């Protein structure tokens, strides 16, 4: 997952989870990448699927 093309003003709402370094399960790649941007690049991908 590459978030360089973010942030994005809107995200679709399908569920395909990713697990962040903050132990939070992010619902999809768009939600995850917007969160990475919001954290000013401190959040990273722990693994794919739910945490």
């Amino acid at each position: 997952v590459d978030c360089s093309e973010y942030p994005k003003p809107a995200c679709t709402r399908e569920y395909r989870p990713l697990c962040g370094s903050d132990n939070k399960t992010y619902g999809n790649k768009c939600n995850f990448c917007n969160a990475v941007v919001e954290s000013n690049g401190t959040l990273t991908l722990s693994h794919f699927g739910k945490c």
Partner: protein, 185 residues
């Protein structure tokens, strides 16, 4: 199974929008971004209960898709959870609406604008969307937006979440019913 319930494809989970029919053929509507590249749909994560197969998909530009039921025994309720749906209508600014999705359940709000353009990036732009102040979260895609017994739209996307609040855009259901020649029941 009814509007708002979970649906699973090979790729992920979305929500069933509305059960509809044409003659004696039953289908369900959901978001086009969920039907895109999906063939078979199941009722559970285990993929043991088949629902049917994708019959049409329109995304981007629009955001709707339709799945033809192949499961002959599963109940196909013309409701949203327990709420009966008896017709479809056009959204209007200030209309009180309710959304039901497989992740967040039922949430209400109002229509704040019509004919909105939403850019999901990478050339995925959808047009003519209903803007609302209703929240939605991953898994809720394709779930129904209704107002009393009236079907209004299908959840497409937006921002925020149900805790802090958000903005969700919906595809007008009338356009999908017309494209496929189906009707709610």
């Amino acid at each position: 199974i009814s509007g708002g319930d979970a649906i699973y494809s090979s790729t992920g989970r979305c929500s069933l929008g509305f059960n509809v029919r044409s003659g004696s053929t039953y289908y369900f509507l959901t978001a086009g971004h969920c039907t895109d590249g999906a063939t078979t749909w199941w009722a559970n994560s285990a993929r043991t209960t088949v629902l049917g197969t994708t019959s049409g998909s329109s995304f981007p530009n629009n955001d709707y898709g339709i799945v033809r039921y192949t499961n002959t025994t599963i109940p196909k309720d013309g409701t949203v959870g327990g709420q009966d749906i008896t017709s479809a209508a056009n959204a209007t600014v200030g209309m009180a609406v309710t959304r039901r999705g497989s992740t967040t359940g039922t949430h209400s709000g109002s229509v704040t604008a019509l004919n909105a353009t939403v850019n999901y990036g990478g050339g995925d732009v959808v047009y003519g969307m209903i803007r609302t102040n209703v929240c939605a979260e991953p898994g809720d895609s394709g779930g129904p937006l209704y107002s009393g017994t009236r079907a209004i739209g299908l959840t497409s996307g937006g921002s925020g979440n149900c805790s802090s609040g958000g903005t969700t855009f919906f595809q007008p259901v009338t356009e999908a019913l017309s494209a496929y020649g189906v009707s709610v029941y």
